[PDB]
């Protein structure tokens, strides 16, 4: 039931004079916004990506992000000019909010440096990560002391502005986020487990939402050796899943793949393994 909205940023600093930034907005795993880094503007990926916010609100946010990117990818280089050979390095930022089932908002703002936790924002203060050392302490010192209401602005953004935006997005995107899309399925062979053995694969693709049930069956007996892949993304907001089973040659006959999904409304997909059984 917990739903979340995150703005992510990836900064790659190659040397003292050269860096590249990338940024995007995500509603759970659904990308809803991009950033045009040259014009410095928000890209609204869906008709409903404005949420319920006004154009004045969204343009003020754009300007906030611009001022911020300025300050960040200036001060970072100014300081990393001294400690070169650290180059190339990469900074990741994940800022957002999570709404719990009772409605309680929870904000976060985590930073990573070269893929390790650098710091995070816990209450009203920037706390360095235990692992990383004096670097995290330096960054936290500059944020907690030199920088004015960027701490206060982050606070209001991730605790009040972000929940409001998330809910407005869910509402504005009502017909999209509540949609049901039916999968299709098909069988294939996978890589040979061994001589005298077969790998049966049942592909299920195009379903939404993500909960799905897929099993190899012998009539009504679920086959215990079934392995479920990870649920993988398709373009345009559906999902893909592989279910596989290794079987001895001569024991594949009679096996079927069975797929259940909310979109199917009790009409499961059943596919029987044929292989080279049919001349």
Ligand X SMILES: CCCCCCC[C@H](C)CCC[C@H](C)CCC[C@H](C)CCC[C@H](C)CCC[C@H](C)CCCOP(=O)(O)O[C@@H]1O[C@H](CO)[C@@H](O)[C@H](O)[C@@H]1O
Ligand Y SMILES: CCCCCCCCCCCCC/C=C/[C@@H](O)[C@@H](CO[C@@H]1O[C@H](CO)[C@@H](O[C@@H]2O[C@H](CO)[C@H](O)[C@H](O[C@]3(C(=O)O)C[C@H](O)[C@@H](NC(C)=O)[C@H]([C@H](O)[C@@H](CO)O[C@]4(C(=O)O)C[C@H](O)[C@@H](NC(C)=O)[C@H]([C@@H](O)[C@@H](O)CO)O4)O3)[C@H]2O)[C@H](O)[C@H]1O)NC(=O)CCCCCCCCCCCCCCCCC
Ligand Z SMILES: *[C@@H]1O[C@H](CO)[C@@H](O)[C@H](O)[C@H]1NC(C)=O
Query: Would you tell me which residues interact with ligand Z (CB under 6 A)?
Result: 14-15, 17-18
- 24 counts as binding ligand X under rule CB under 6 A: yes
- Helix (H) or strand (E) holding 102, with range, is none
Torsions phi, psi for 264 (to 5 deg): -85, -15
Residue 85, binding choice from another protein, ligand KZF, ligand Y, none, Cβ under 5 to 8 Å by partner class = ligand Y
Determine contact, residues 80/89, Cβ cutoff 8 Å: yes
Closer by beta carbon to ligand X, 23 or else 183: 23
d(CA 107, CA 88): 31
Among 143, 157, 247, 259, binds ligand X (CB under 6 A): 157
Asked if residues 239 and 195 have their Cβ atoms less than 8 Å apart, the reply is no
Q: Which two tokens stand for residue 183?
A: 């999968």
**DSSP 8-state symbol, 131:** S
Residue of 64, 167, 217, 228 interacting with ligand X (CB under 6 A) = 64
3-state SS class at 270? strand
C-alpha 185/C-alpha 183 separation (Å) is 7
Distance CA 48, CA 43 (A): 12
Q: Select the residue interacting with another protein from 3, 4, 28, 34 (CB under 8 A).
A: 34
Q: Which stretch binds ligand X (CB under 6 A): 80-88, 93-101, 127-135, 174-182?
A: 93-101
Task: For residue 37, state whether it binds another protein (rule: CB under 8 A).
Answer: no
Our finding on whether 30 is near Cl ion (CB under 5 A) is yes
Which spans of this chain sit near another protein (rule: CB under 8 A)? 8, 10, 12, 22, 24, 26, 31, 34, 88, 90, 92, 94, 112, 114-117, 184, 186, 188-189, 201, 203, 205-206, 230, 232-235, 240, 242
């Amino acid at each position: 039931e917990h739903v979340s909205f995150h703005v992510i940023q990836i900064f790659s600093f190659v040397n003292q004079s050269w860096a590249r930034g990338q940024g995007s907005g995500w509603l759970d795993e659904l990308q809803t916004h991009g950033w045009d880094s040259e014009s410095g503007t928000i890209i609204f990926l869906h008709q409903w990506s404005k949420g319920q916010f006004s154009n004045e609100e969204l343009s003020d946010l754009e300007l906030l992000f611009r001022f911020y990117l300025f300050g960040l990818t200036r001060e970072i280089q100014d300081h990393a000019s001294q400690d070169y050979s650290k180059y190339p390095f990469e900074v990741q930022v994940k800022a957002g909010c999570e709404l719990h089932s009772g409605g309680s908002p929870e904000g976060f703002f985590q930073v990573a440096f070269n893929g390790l936790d650098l710091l995070s924002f816990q209450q009203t203060t920037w706390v360095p990560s235990p692992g990383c050392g004096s670097l995290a302490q330096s960054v936290c010192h500059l944020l907690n002391h030199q920088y004015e209401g960027v701490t206060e602005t982050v606070y209001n953004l991730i605790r009040s502005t972000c929940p409001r935006f998330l809910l407005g997005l869910l509402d504005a995107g009502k017909m999209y986020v509540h949609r049901q899309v039916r999968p299709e399925a098909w069988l294939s062979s996978g890589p040979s487990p061994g001589p005298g053995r077969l790998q049966l694969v049942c592909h299920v693709s195009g379903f939404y939402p993500k909960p799905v049930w897929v099993m190899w069956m012998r009539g009504e007996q679920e086959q215990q050796g079934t392995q479920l892949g990870d649920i993988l993304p398709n373009a345009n907001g559906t999902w893909y899943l592989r279910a596989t089973l290794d079987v001895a040659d001569g024991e594949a006959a009679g096996l079927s793949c069975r797929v259940k999904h909310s979109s199917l409304e009790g009409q499961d997909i059943i596919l029987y393994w044929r292989g080279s059984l049919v001349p």
